[PDB]
Amino acid sequence: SPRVVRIVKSESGYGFNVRGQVSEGGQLRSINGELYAPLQHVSAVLPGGAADRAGVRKGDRILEVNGVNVEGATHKQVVDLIRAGEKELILTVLSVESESKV
Amino acid sequence: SPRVVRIVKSESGYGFNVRGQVSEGGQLRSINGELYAPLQHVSAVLPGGAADRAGVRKGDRILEVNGVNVEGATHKQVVDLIRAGEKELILTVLSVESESKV
């Protein structure tokens, strides 16, 4: 289920890489057993960076950026939204990797 | 725009799968808003393999293999070019997925 994560920008920026469609129009995909228009995803998280500390996970699919639903958005639209926040970022993500404390 | 990627072969080979026309002659296709004769594409990248580490992306369309333009080539022509290099591979690819560091 979609989860919300806050990241405060450090010196290394937010500390993650985003990957996804350069253009609009990709076909619908099945993510966590449900259909979405194409999502950008977290392709890497800088170990020790802000996103890692905040609990962003490699493979997280990005559903919202600072309250804006970015389902089927272009890569540039999403990265521009992230970069428009100069200190904080709120993501809603569909994680392909779960986490539990034991 | 076409980008260049180097991959050094590991134990798992280069660590990706190639898909594309078995025979020559497919019709021109529109890729990233431009016309090309049929391209082979990266259908999967082995997570943790050499291609993943080098930054090859699932969906990358293969424009050149070790300096050879393979626009409209057959699948076997392209795979033979890849395999003729026993340690290194240079690809020029048109990525359907962009990546940015934030």
Side-chain angles (χ1 to χ4, degrees):
Chain A
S1 66
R3 73 194 186 91
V4 181
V5 62
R6 173 161 175 273
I7 315 96
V8 179
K9 206 194 292 210
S10 69
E11 340 209 61
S12 40
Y14 297 107
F16 68 96
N17 294 346
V18 188
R19 272 198 195 162
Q21 71 179 359
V22 59
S23 287
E24 260 179 68
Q27 58 193 327
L28 300 188
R29 310 219 224 292
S30 171
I31 306 151
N32 285 3
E34 298 262 288
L35 301 164
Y36 300 90
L39 301 179
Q40 303 294 304
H41 74 275
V42 176
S43 53
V45 179
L46 168 64
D52 187 38
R53 299 175 312 242
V56 178
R57 298 176 199 148
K58 174 178 181 154
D60 279 358
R61 260 73 188 162
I62 305 170
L63 286 167
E64 304 192 17
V65 172
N66 301 148
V68 172
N69 186 283
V70 289
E71 190 187 330
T74 73
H75 185 258
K76 174 174 169 51
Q77 282 171 344
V78 174
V79 175
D80 285 357
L81 288 166
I82 290 171
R83 297 199 171 126
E86 329 142 275
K87 196 159 187 185
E88 73 156 44
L89 171 61
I90 310 298
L91 292 175
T92 306
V93 297
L94 292 164
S95 297
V96 296
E97 289 205 324
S98 299
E99 179 191 274
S100 298
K101 180 147 193 46
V102 290
Chain B
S1 66
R3 73 194 186 91
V4 181
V5 62
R6 173 161 175 273
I7 315 96
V8 179
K9 206 194 292 210
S10 69
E11 340 209 61
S12 40
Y14 297 107
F16 68 96
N17 294 346
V18 188
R19 272 198 195 162
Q21 71 179 359
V22 59
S23 287
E24 260 179 68
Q27 58 193 327
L28 300 188
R29 310 219 224 292
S30 171
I31 306 151
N32 285 3
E34 298 262 288
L35 301 164
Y36 300 90
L39 301 179
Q40 303 294 304
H41 74 275
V42 176
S43 53
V45 179
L46 168 64
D52 187 38
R53 299 175 312 242
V56 178
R57 298 176 199 148
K58 174 178 181 154
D60 279 358
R61 260 73 188 162
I62 305 170
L63 286 167
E64 304 192 17
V65 172
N66 301 148
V68 172
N69 186 283
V70 289
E71 190 187 330
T74 73
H75 185 258
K76 174 174 169 51
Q77 282 171 344
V78 174
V79 175
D80 285 357
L81 288 166
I82 290 171
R83 297 199 171 126
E86 329 142 275
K87 196 159 187 185
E88 73 156 44
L89 171 61
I90 310 298
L91 292 175
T92 306
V93 297
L94 292 164
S95 297
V96 296
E97 289 205 324
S98 299
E99 179 191 274
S100 298
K101 180 147 193 46
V102 290

mmCIF file with all atom_site columns, all heavy atoms in Angstrom, chain A residues 8-35:
data_model
loop_
_atom_site.group_PDB
_atom_site.id
_atom_site.type_symbol
_atom_site.label_atom_id
_atom_site.label_alt_id
_atom_site.label_comp_id
_atom_site.label_asym_id
_atom_site.label_entity_id
_atom_site.label_seq_id
_atom_site.pdbx_PDB_ins_code
_atom_site.Cartn_x
_atom_site.Cartn_y
_atom_site.Cartn_z
_atom_site.occupancy
_atom_site.B_iso_or_equiv
_atom_site.pdbx_formal_charge
_atom_site.auth_seq_id
_atom_site.auth_comp_id
_atom_site.auth_asym_id
_atom_site.auth_atom_id
_atom_site.pdbx_PDB_model_num
ATOM 1   N N   . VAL A 1 8  ? 14.707 15.570 4.075   1.00 0.00 ? 8  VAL A N   1
ATOM 2   C CA  . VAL A 1 8  ? 15.246 16.956 4.164   1.00 0.00 ? 8  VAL A CA  1
ATOM 3   C C   . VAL A 1 8  ? 16.564 16.976 3.403   1.00 0.00 ? 8  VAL A C   1
ATOM 4   O O   . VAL A 1 8  ? 17.449 16.158 3.658   1.00 0.00 ? 8  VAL A O   1
ATOM 5   C CB  . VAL A 1 8  ? 15.488 17.395 5.654   1.00 0.00 ? 8  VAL A CB  1
ATOM 6   C CG1 . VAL A 1 8  ? 16.056 18.822 5.681   1.00 0.00 ? 8  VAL A CG1 1
ATOM 7   C CG2 . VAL A 1 8  ? 14.196 17.354 6.433   1.00 0.00 ? 8  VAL A CG2 1
ATOM 8   N N   . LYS A 1 9  ? 16.700 17.892 2.475   1.00 0.00 ? 9  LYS A N   1
ATOM 9   C CA  . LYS A 1 9  ? 17.914 17.948 1.629   1.00 0.00 ? 9  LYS A CA  1
ATOM 10  C C   . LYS A 1 9  ? 19.168 18.178 2.436   1.00 0.00 ? 9  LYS A C   1
ATOM 11  O O   . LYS A 1 9  ? 19.174 19.026 3.314   1.00 0.00 ? 9  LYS A O   1
ATOM 12  C CB  . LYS A 1 9  ? 17.752 19.048 0.574   1.00 0.00 ? 9  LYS A CB  1
ATOM 13  C CG  . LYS A 1 9  ? 18.584 18.786 -0.648  1.00 0.00 ? 9  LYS A CG  1
ATOM 14  C CD  . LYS A 1 9  ? 18.697 20.015 -1.529  1.00 0.00 ? 9  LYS A CD  1
ATOM 15  C CE  . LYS A 1 9  ? 17.365 20.350 -2.159  1.00 0.00 ? 9  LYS A CE  1
ATOM 16  N NZ  . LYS A 1 9  ? 17.495 21.028 -3.511  1.00 0.00 ? 9  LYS A NZ  1
ATOM 17  N N   . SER A 1 10 ? 20.204 17.364 2.196   1.00 0.00 ? 10 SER A N   1
ATOM 18  C CA  . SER A 1 10 ? 21.546 17.641 2.744   1.00 0.00 ? 10 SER A CA  1
ATOM 19  C C   . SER A 1 10 ? 22.510 18.229 1.692   1.00 0.00 ? 10 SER A C   1
ATOM 20  O O   . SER A 1 10 ? 22.069 18.771 0.660   1.00 0.00 ? 10 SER A O   1
ATOM 21  C CB  . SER A 1 10 ? 22.142 16.397 3.431   1.00 0.00 ? 10 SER A CB  1
ATOM 22  O OG  . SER A 1 10 ? 22.477 15.372 2.521   1.00 0.00 ? 10 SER A OG  1
ATOM 23  N N   . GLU A 1 11 ? 23.816 18.151 1.987   1.00 0.00 ? 11 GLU A N   1
ATOM 24  C CA  . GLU A 1 11 ? 24.914 18.588 1.068   1.00 0.00 ? 11 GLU A CA  1
ATOM 25  C C   . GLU A 1 11 ? 24.969 17.718 -0.195  1.00 0.00 ? 11 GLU A C   1
ATOM 26  O O   . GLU A 1 11 ? 25.254 18.171 -1.294  1.00 0.00 ? 11 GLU A O   1
ATOM 27  C CB  . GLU A 1 11 ? 26.299 18.471 1.743   1.00 0.00 ? 11 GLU A CB  1
ATOM 28  C CG  . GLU A 1 11 ? 26.322 18.406 3.293   1.00 0.00 ? 11 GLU A CG  1
ATOM 29  C CD  . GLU A 1 11 ? 27.620 19.002 3.878   1.00 0.00 ? 11 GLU A CD  1
ATOM 30  O OE1 . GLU A 1 11 ? 27.864 20.217 3.639   1.00 0.00 ? 11 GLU A OE1 1
ATOM 31  O OE2 . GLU A 1 11 ? 28.393 18.266 4.566   1.00 0.00 ? 11 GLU A OE2 1
ATOM 32  N N   . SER A 1 12 ? 24.712 16.434 -0.010  1.00 0.00 ? 12 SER A N   1
ATOM 33  C CA  . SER A 1 12 ? 24.690 15.514 -1.109  1.00 0.00 ? 12 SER A CA  1
ATOM 34  C C   . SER A 1 12 ? 23.360 15.551 -1.908  1.00 0.00 ? 12 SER A C   1
ATOM 35  O O   . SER A 1 12 ? 23.132 14.613 -2.689  1.00 0.00 ? 12 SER A O   1
ATOM 36  C CB  . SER A 1 12 ? 25.011 14.069 -0.605  1.00 0.00 ? 12 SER A CB  1
ATOM 37  O OG  . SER A 1 12 ? 24.393 13.719 0.661   1.00 0.00 ? 12 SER A OG  1
ATOM 38  N N   . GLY A 1 13 ? 22.539 16.602 -1.714  1.00 0.00 ? 13 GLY A N   1
ATOM 39  C CA  . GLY A 1 13 ? 21.140 16.730 -2.247  1.00 0.00 ? 13 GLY A CA  1
ATOM 40  C C   . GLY A 1 13 ? 20.201 15.799 -1.462  1.00 0.00 ? 13 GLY A C   1
ATOM 41  O O   . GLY A 1 13 ? 20.415 15.595 -0.285  1.00 0.00 ? 13 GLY A O   1
ATOM 42  N N   . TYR A 1 14 ? 19.180 15.226 -2.096  1.00 0.00 ? 14 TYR A N   1
ATOM 43  C CA  . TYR A 1 14 ? 18.342 14.221 -1.388  1.00 0.00 ? 14 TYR A CA  1
ATOM 44  C C   . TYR A 1 14 ? 18.962 12.884 -1.315  1.00 0.00 ? 14 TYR A C   1
ATOM 45  O O   . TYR A 1 14 ? 18.584 12.076 -0.435  1.00 0.00 ? 14 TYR A O   1
ATOM 46  C CB  . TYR A 1 14 ? 16.918 14.130 -1.996  1.00 0.00 ? 14 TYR A CB  1
ATOM 47  C CG  . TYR A 1 14 ? 16.185 15.378 -1.860  1.00 0.00 ? 14 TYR A CG  1
ATOM 48  C CD1 . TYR A 1 14 ? 15.956 16.204 -2.959  1.00 0.00 ? 14 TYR A CD1 1
ATOM 49  C CD2 . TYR A 1 14 ? 15.671 15.756 -0.602  1.00 0.00 ? 14 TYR A CD2 1
ATOM 50  C CE1 . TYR A 1 14 ? 15.210 17.407 -2.817  1.00 0.00 ? 14 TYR A CE1 1
ATOM 51  C CE2 . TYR A 1 14 ? 14.911 16.952 -0.439  1.00 0.00 ? 14 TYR A CE2 1
ATOM 52  C CZ  . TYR A 1 14 ? 14.697 17.774 -1.526  1.00 0.00 ? 14 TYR A CZ  1
ATOM 53  O OH  . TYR A 1 14 ? 13.982 18.992 -1.369  1.00 0.00 ? 14 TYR A OH  1
ATOM 54  N N   . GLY A 1 15 ? 19.933 12.615 -2.187  1.00 0.00 ? 15 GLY A N   1
ATOM 55  C CA  . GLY A 1 15 ? 20.653 11.361 -2.137  1.00 0.00 ? 15 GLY A CA  1
ATOM 56  C C   . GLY A 1 15 ? 19.957 10.140 -2.725  1.00 0.00 ? 15 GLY A C   1
ATOM 57  O O   . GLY A 1 15 ? 19.980 9.024  -2.167  1.00 0.00 ? 15 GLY A O   1
ATOM 58  N N   . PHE A 1 16 ? 19.364 10.308 -3.892  1.00 0.00 ? 16 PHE A N   1
ATOM 59  C CA  . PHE A 1 16 ? 18.845 9.159  -4.616  1.00 0.00 ? 16 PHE A CA  1
ATOM 60  C C   . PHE A 1 16 ? 18.742 9.489  -6.103  1.00 0.00 ? 16 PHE A C   1
ATOM 61  O O   . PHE A 1 16 ? 18.793 10.668 -6.491  1.00 0.00 ? 16 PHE A O   1
ATOM 62  C CB  . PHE A 1 16 ? 17.460 8.647  -4.015  1.00 0.00 ? 16 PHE A CB  1
ATOM 63  C CG  . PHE A 1 16 ? 16.260 9.611  -4.204  1.00 0.00 ? 16 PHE A CG  1
ATOM 64  C CD1 . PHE A 1 16 ? 15.365 9.422  -5.308  1.00 0.00 ? 16 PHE A CD1 1
ATOM 65  C CD2 . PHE A 1 16 ? 15.986 10.623 -3.289  1.00 0.00 ? 16 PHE A CD2 1
ATOM 66  C CE1 . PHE A 1 16 ? 14.219 10.260 -5.489  1.00 0.00 ? 16 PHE A CE1 1
ATOM 67  C CE2 . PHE A 1 16 ? 14.880 11.458 -3.456  1.00 0.00 ? 16 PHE A CE2 1
ATOM 68  C CZ  . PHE A 1 16 ? 13.988 11.272 -4.546  1.00 0.00 ? 16 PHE A CZ  1
ATOM 69  N N   . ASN A 1 17 ? 18.568 8.434  -6.917  1.00 0.00 ? 17 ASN A N   1
ATOM 70  C CA  . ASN A 1 17 ? 18.467 8.567  -8.346  1.00 0.00 ? 17 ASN A CA  1
ATOM 71  C C   . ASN A 1 17 ? 17.067 8.143  -8.722  1.00 0.00 ? 17 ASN A C   1
ATOM 72  O O   . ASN A 1 17 ? 16.524 7.203  -8.144  1.00 0.00 ? 17 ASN A O   1
ATOM 73  C CB  . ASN A 1 17 ? 19.426 7.644  -9.070  1.00 0.00 ? 17 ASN A CB  1
ATOM 74  C CG  . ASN A 1 17 ? 20.912 8.009  -8.835  1.00 0.00 ? 17 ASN A CG  1
ATOM 75  O OD1 . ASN A 1 17 ? 21.231 9.087  -8.347  1.00 0.00 ? 17 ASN A OD1 1
ATOM 76  N ND2 . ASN A 1 17 ? 21.809 7.117  -9.243  1.00 0.00 ? 17 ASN A ND2 1
ATOM 77  N N   . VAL A 1 18 ? 16.492 8.856  -9.678  1.00 0.00 ? 18 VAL A N   1
ATOM 78  C CA  . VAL A 1 18 ? 15.182 8.602  -10.243 1.00 0.00 ? 18 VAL A CA  1
ATOM 79  C C   . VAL A 1 18 ? 15.306 8.125  -11.680 1.00 0.00 ? 18 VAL A C   1
ATOM 80  O O   . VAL A 1 18 ? 16.082 8.684  -12.473 1.00 0.00 ? 18 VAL A O   1
ATOM 81  C CB  . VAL A 1 18 ? 14.304 9.903  -10.292 1.00 0.00 ? 18 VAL A CB  1
ATOM 82  C CG1 . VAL A 1 18 ? 12.836 9.556  -10.704 1.00 0.00 ? 18 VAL A CG1 1
ATOM 83  C CG2 . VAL A 1 18 ? 14.301 10.502 -8.956  1.00 0.00 ? 18 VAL A CG2 1
ATOM 84  N N   . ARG A 1 19 ? 14.557 7.073  -11.990 1.00 0.00 ? 19 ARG A N   1
ATOM 85  C CA  . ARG A 1 19 ? 14.496 6.553  -13.370 1.00 0.00 ? 19 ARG A CA  1
ATOM 86  C C   . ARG A 1 19 ? 13.077 6.449  -13.848 1.00 0.00 ? 19 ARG A C   1
ATOM 87  O O   . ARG A 1 19 ? 12.200 6.024  -13.115 1.00 0.00 ? 19 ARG A O   1
ATOM 88  C CB  . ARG A 1 19 ? 15.109 5.144  -13.448 1.00 0.00 ? 19 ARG A CB  1
ATOM 89  C CG  . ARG A 1 19 ? 16.535 5.122  -13.689 1.00 0.00 ? 19 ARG A CG  1
ATOM 90  C CD  . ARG A 1 19 ? 16.929 3.730  -14.185 1.00 0.00 ? 19 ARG A CD  1
ATOM 91  N NE  . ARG A 1 19 ? 18.361 3.725  -14.034 1.00 0.00 ? 19 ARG A NE  1
ATOM 92  C CZ  . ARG A 1 19 ? 19.104 2.621  -14.009 1.00 0.00 ? 19 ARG A CZ  1
ATOM 93  N NH1 . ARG A 1 19 ? 18.493 1.442  -14.140 1.00 0.00 ? 19 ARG A NH1 1
ATOM 94  N NH2 . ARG A 1 19 ? 20.420 2.751  -13.866 1.00 0.00 ? 19 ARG A NH2 1
ATOM 95  N N   . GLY A 1 20 ? 12.840 6.729  -15.126 1.00 0.00 ? 20 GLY A N   1
ATOM 96  C CA  . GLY A 1 20 ? 11.515 6.479  -15.647 1.00 0.00 ? 20 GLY A CA  1
ATOM 97  C C   . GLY A 1 20 ? 11.307 7.118  -16.992 1.00 0.00 ? 20 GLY A C   1
ATOM 98  O O   . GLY A 1 20 ? 12.217 7.784  -17.516 1.00 0.00 ? 20 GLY A O   1
ATOM 99  N N   . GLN A 1 21 ? 10.107 6.891  -17.530 1.00 0.00 ? 21 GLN A N   1
ATOM 100 C CA  . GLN A 1 21 ? 9.843  7.304  -18.931 1.00 0.00 ? 21 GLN A CA  1
ATOM 101 C C   . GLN A 1 21 ? 10.239 8.734  -19.279 1.00 0.00 ? 21 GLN A C   1
ATOM 102 O O   . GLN A 1 21 ? 9.869  9.689  -18.593 1.00 0.00 ? 21 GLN A O   1
ATOM 103 C CB  . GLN A 1 21 ? 8.427  7.009  -19.367 1.00 0.00 ? 21 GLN A CB  1
ATOM 104 C CG  . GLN A 1 21 ? 7.347  7.913  -18.717 1.00 0.00 ? 21 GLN A CG  1
ATOM 105 C CD  . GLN A 1 21 ? 5.934  7.628  -19.174 1.00 0.00 ? 21 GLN A CD  1
ATOM 106 O OE1 . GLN A 1 21 ? 5.670  6.740  -20.024 1.00 0.00 ? 21 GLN A OE1 1
ATOM 107 N NE2 . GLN A 1 21 ? 4.996  8.404  -18.614 1.00 0.00 ? 21 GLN A NE2 1
ATOM 108 N N   . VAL A 1 22 ? 11.018 8.905  -20.370 1.00 0.00 ? 22 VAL A N   1
ATOM 109 C CA  . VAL A 1 22 ? 11.407 10.257 -20.831 1.00 0.00 ? 22 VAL A CA  1
ATOM 110 C C   . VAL A 1 22 ? 10.173 11.017 -21.410 1.00 0.00 ? 22 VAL A C   1
ATOM 111 O O   . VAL A 1 22 ? 10.057 12.247 -21.291 1.00 0.00 ? 22 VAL A O   1
ATOM 112 C CB  . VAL A 1 22 ? 12.611 10.176 -21.868 1.00 0.00 ? 22 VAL A CB  1
ATOM 113 C CG1 . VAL A 1 22 ? 12.213 9.349  -23.050 1.00 0.00 ? 22 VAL A CG1 1
ATOM 114 C CG2 . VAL A 1 22 ? 13.096 11.627 -22.231 1.00 0.00 ? 22 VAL A CG2 1
ATOM 115 N N   . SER A 1 23 ? 9.276  10.280 -22.055 1.00 0.00 ? 23 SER A N   1
ATOM 116 C CA  . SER A 1 23 ? 8.053  10.855 -22.652 1.00 0.00 ? 23 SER A CA  1
ATOM 117 C C   . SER A 1 23 ? 6.835  10.303 -22.066 1.00 0.00 ? 23 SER A C   1
ATOM 118 O O   . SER A 1 23 ? 6.828  9.157  -21.660 1.00 0.00 ? 23 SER A O   1
ATOM 119 C CB  . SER A 1 23 ? 7.949  10.571 -24.162 1.00 0.00 ? 23 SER A CB  1
ATOM 120 O OG  . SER A 1 23 ? 8.878  11.357 -24.863 1.00 0.00 ? 23 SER A OG  1
ATOM 121 N N   . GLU A 1 24 ? 5.753  11.070 -22.173 1.00 0.00 ? 24 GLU A N   1
ATOM 122 C CA  . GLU A 1 24 ? 4.464  10.621 -21.741 1.00 0.00 ? 24 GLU A CA  1
ATOM 123 C C   . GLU A 1 24 ? 3.902  9.575  -22.700 1.00 0.00 ? 24 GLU A C   1
ATOM 124 O O   . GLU A 1 24 ? 4.257  9.544  -23.888 1.00 0.00 ? 24 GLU A O   1
ATOM 125 C CB  . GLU A 1 24 ? 3.497  11.796 -21.719 1.00 0.00 ? 24 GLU A CB  1
ATOM 126 C CG  . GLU A 1 24 ? 3.224  12.426 -20.405 1.00 0.00 ? 24 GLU A CG  1
ATOM 127 C CD  . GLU A 1 24 ? 2.266  13.573 -20.555 1.00 0.00 ? 24 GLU A CD  1
ATOM 128 O OE1 . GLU A 1 24 ? 1.084  13.308 -20.874 1.00 0.00 ? 24 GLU A OE1 1
ATOM 129 O OE2 . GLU A 1 24 ? 2.701  14.750 -20.389 1.00 0.00 ? 24 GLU A OE2 1
ATOM 130 N N   . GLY A 1 25 ? 2.982  8.758  -22.218 1.00 0.00 ? 25 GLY A N   1
ATOM 131 C CA  . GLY A 1 25 ? 2.314  7.799  -23.088 1.00 0.00 ? 25 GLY A CA  1
ATOM 132 C C   . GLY A 1 25 ? 2.645  6.306  -22.972 1.00 0.00 ? 25 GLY A C   1
ATOM 133 O O   . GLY A 1 25 ? 2.029  5.470  -23.668 1.00 0.00 ? 25 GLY A O   1
ATOM 134 N N   . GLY A 1 26 ? 3.616  5.945  -22.143 1.00 0.00 ? 26 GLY A N   1
ATOM 135 C CA  . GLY A 1 26 ? 3.904  4.519  -21.905 1.00 0.00 ? 26 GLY A CA  1
ATOM 136 C C   . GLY A 1 26 ? 2.648  3.744  -21.565 1.00 0.00 ? 26 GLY A C   1
ATOM 137 O O   . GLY A 1 26 ? 1.689  4.315  -21.095 1.00 0.00 ? 26 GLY A O   1
ATOM 138 N N   . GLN A 1 27 ? 2.615  2.431  -21.795 1.00 0.00 ? 27 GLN A N   1
ATOM 139 C CA  . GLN A 1 27 ? 1.360  1.685  -21.502 1.00 0.00 ? 27 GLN A CA  1
ATOM 140 C C   . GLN A 1 27 ? 1.246  1.489  -19.978 1.00 0.00 ? 27 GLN A C   1
ATOM 141 O O   . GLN A 1 27 ? 2.235  1.607  -19.273 1.00 0.00 ? 27 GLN A O   1
ATOM 142 C CB  . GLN A 1 27 ? 1.328  0.330  -22.215 1.00 0.00 ? 27 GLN A CB  1
ATOM 143 C CG  . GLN A 1 27 ? 2.497  -0.535 -21.842 1.00 0.00 ? 27 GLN A CG  1
ATOM 144 C CD  . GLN A 1 27 ? 2.672  -1.751 -22.753 1.00 0.00 ? 27 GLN A CD  1
ATOM 145 O OE1 . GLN A 1 27 ? 1.702  -2.317 -23.262 1.00 0.00 ? 27 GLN A OE1 1
ATOM 146 N NE2 . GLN A 1 27 ? 3.921  -2.154 -22.947 1.00 0.00 ? 27 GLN A NE2 1
ATOM 147 N N   . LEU A 1 28 ? 0.045  1.194  -19.502 1.00 0.00 ? 28 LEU A N   1
ATOM 148 C CA  . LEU A 1 28 ? -0.183 0.876  -18.099 1.00 0.00 ? 28 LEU A CA  1
ATOM 149 C C   . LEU A 1 28 ? 0.674  -0.299 -17.666 1.00 0.00 ? 28 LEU A C   1
ATOM 150 O O   . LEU A 1 28 ? 0.956  -1.196 -18.472 1.00 0.00 ? 28 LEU A O   1
ATOM 151 C CB  . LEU A 1 28 ? -1.673 0.582  -17.837 1.00 0.00 ? 28 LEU A CB  1
ATOM 152 C CG  . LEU A 1 28 ? -2.754 1.654  -18.124 1.00 0.00 ? 28 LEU A CG  1
ATOM 153 C CD1 . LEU A 1 28 ? -4.098 1.183  -17.612 1.00 0.00 ? 28 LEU A CD1 1
ATOM 154 C CD2 . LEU A 1 28 ? -2.414 2.986  -17.543 1.00 0.00 ? 28 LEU A CD2 1
ATOM 155 N N   . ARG A 1 29 ? 1.115  -0.292 -16.409 1.00 0.00 ? 29 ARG A N   1
ATOM 156 C CA  . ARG A 1 29 ? 1.912  -1.383 -15.878 1.00 0.00 ? 29 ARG A CA  1
ATOM 157 C C   . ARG A 1 29 ? 1.295  -1.915 -14.654 1.00 0.00 ? 29 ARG A C   1
ATOM 158 O O   . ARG A 1 29 ? 0.633  -1.196 -13.918 1.00 0.00 ? 29 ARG A O   1
ATOM 159 C CB  . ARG A 1 29 ? 3.269  -0.906 -15.419 1.00 0.00 ? 29 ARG A CB  1
ATOM 160 C CG  . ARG A 1 29 ? 3.996  -0.101 -16.374 1.00 0.00 ? 29 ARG A CG  1
ATOM 161 C CD  . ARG A 1 29 ? 5.377  -0.599 -16.172 1.00 0.00 ? 29 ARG A CD  1
ATOM 162 N NE  . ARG A 1 29 ? 6.244  0.531  -16.134 1.00 0.00 ? 29 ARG A NE  1
ATOM 163 C CZ  . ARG A 1 29 ? 6.466  1.280  -17.185 1.00 0.00 ? 29 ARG A CZ  1
ATOM 164 N NH1 . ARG A 1 29 ? 5.850  0.979  -18.323 1.00 0.00 ? 29 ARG A NH1 1
ATOM 165 N NH2 . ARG A 1 29 ? 7.300  2.304  -17.088 1.00 0.00 ? 29 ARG A NH2 1
ATOM 166 N N   . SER A 1 30 ? 1.614  -3.172 -14.370 1.00 0.00 ? 30 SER A N   1
ATOM 167 C CA  . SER A 1 30 ? 1.159  -3.799 -13.111 1.00 0.00 ? 30 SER A CA  1
ATOM 168 C C   . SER A 1 30 ? 2.275  -3.644 -12.035 1.00 0.00 ? 30 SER A C   1
ATOM 169 O O   . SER A 1 30 ? 3.429  -4.087 -12.238 1.00 0.00 ? 30 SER A O   1
ATOM 170 C CB  . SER A 1 30 ? 0.726  -5.242 -13.376 1.00 0.00 ? 30 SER A CB  1
ATOM 171 O OG  . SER A 1 30 ? 0.485  -5.954 -12.185 1.00 0.00 ? 30 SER A OG  1
ATOM 172 N N   . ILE A 1 31 ? 1.948  -2.947 -10.936 1.00 0.00 ? 31 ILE A N   1
ATOM 173 C CA  . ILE A 1 31 ? 2.881  -2.661 -9.817  1.00 0.00 ? 31 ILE A CA  1
ATOM 174 C C   . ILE A 1 31 ? 2.216  -3.049 -8.494  1.00 0.00 ? 31 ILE A C   1
ATOM 175 O O   . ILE A 1 31 ? 1.190  -2.482 -8.129  1.00 0.00 ? 31 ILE A O   1
ATOM 176 C CB  . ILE A 1 31 ? 3.326  -1.163 -9.737  1.00 0.00 ? 31 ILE A CB  1
ATOM 177 C CG1 . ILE A 1 31 ? 3.906  -0.697 -11.056 1.00 0.00 ? 31 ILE A CG1 1
ATOM 178 C CG2 . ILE A 1 31 ? 4.368  -0.956 -8.637  1.00 0.00 ? 31 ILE A CG2 1
ATOM 179 C CD1 . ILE A 1 31 ? 3.712  0.772  -11.272 1.00 0.00 ? 31 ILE A CD1 1
ATOM 180 N N   . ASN A 1 32 ? 2.827  -3.992 -7.778  1.00 0.00 ? 32 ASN A N   1
ATOM 181 C CA  . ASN A 1 32 ? 2.305  -4.527 -6.512  1.00 0.00 ? 32 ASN A CA  1
ATOM 182 C C   . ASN A 1 32 ? 0.865  -5.099 -6.735  1.00 0.00 ? 32 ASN A C   1
ATOM 183 O O   . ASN A 1 32 ? -0.028 -4.893 -5.877  1.00 0.00 ? 32 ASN A O   1
ATOM 184 C CB  . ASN A 1 32 ? 2.357  -3.472 -5.338  1.00 0.00 ? 32 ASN A CB  1
ATOM 185 C CG  . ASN A 1 32 ? 3.801  -3.224 -4.760  1.00 0.00 ? 32 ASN A CG  1
ATOM 186 O OD1 . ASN A 1 32 ? 4.809  -3.779 -5.242  1.00 0.00 ? 32 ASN A OD1 1
ATOM 187 N ND2 . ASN A 1 32 ? 3.881  -2.367 -3.744  1.00 0.00 ? 32 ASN A ND2 1
ATOM 188 N N   . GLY A 1 33 ? 0.650  -5.785 -7.873  1.00 0.00 ? 33 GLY A N   1
ATOM 189 C CA  . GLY A 1 33 ? -0.675 -6.335 -8.240  1.00 0.00 ? 33 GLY A CA  1
ATOM 190 C C   . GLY A 1 33 ? -1.787 -5.304 -8.575  1.00 0.00 ? 33 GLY A C   1
ATOM 191 O O   . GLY A 1 33 ? -2.968 -5.575 -8.366  1.00 0.00 ? 33 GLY A O   1
ATOM 192 N N   . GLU A 1 34 ? -1.440 -4.138 -9.121  1.00 0.00 ? 34 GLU A N   1
ATOM 193 C CA  . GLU A 1 34 ? -2.440 -3.115 -9.464  1.00 0.00 ? 34 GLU A CA  1
ATOM 194 C C   . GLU A 1 34 ? -1.984 -2.291 -10.673 1.00 0.00 ? 34 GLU A C   1
ATOM 195 O O   . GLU A 1 34 ? -0.778 -2.121 -10.879 1.00 0.00 ? 34 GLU A O   1
ATOM 196 C CB  . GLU A 1 34 ? -2.668 -2.157 -8.277  1.00 0.00 ? 34 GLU A CB  1
ATOM 197 C CG  . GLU A 1 34 ? -3.203 -2.787 -7.018  1.00 0.00 ? 34 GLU A CG  1
ATOM 198 C CD  . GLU A 1 34 ? -4.697 -2.612 -6.928  1.00 0.00 ? 34 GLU A CD  1
ATOM 199 O OE1 . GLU A 1 34 ? -5.140 -1.450 -6.677  1.00 0.00 ? 34 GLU A OE1 1
ATOM 200 O OE2 . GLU A 1 34 ? -5.417 -3.616 -7.130  1.00 0.00 ? 34 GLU A OE2 1
ATOM 201 N N   . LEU A 1 35 ? -2.929 -1.728 -11.422 1.00 0.00 ? 35 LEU A N   1
ATOM 202 C CA  . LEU A 1 35 ? -2.567 -1.010 -12.639 1.00 0.00 ? 35 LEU A CA  1
ATOM 203 C C   . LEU A 1 35 ? -2.353 0.486  -12.428 1.00 0.00 ? 35 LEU A C   1
ATOM 204 O O   . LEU A 1 35 ? -3.168 1.166  -11.802 1.00 0.00 ? 35 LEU A O   1
ATOM 205 C CB  . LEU A 1 35 ? -3.607 -1.219 -13.774 1.00 0.00 ? 35 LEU A CB  1
ATOM 206 C CG  . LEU A 1 35 ? -3.790 -2.689 -14.164 1.00 0.00 ? 35 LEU A CG  1
ATOM 207 C CD1 . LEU A 1 35 ? -5.070 -2.795 -14.966 1.00 0.00 ? 35 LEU A CD1 1
ATOM 208 C CD2 . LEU A 1 35 ? -2.590 -3.146 -14.986 1.00 0.00 ? 35 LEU A CD2 1
#
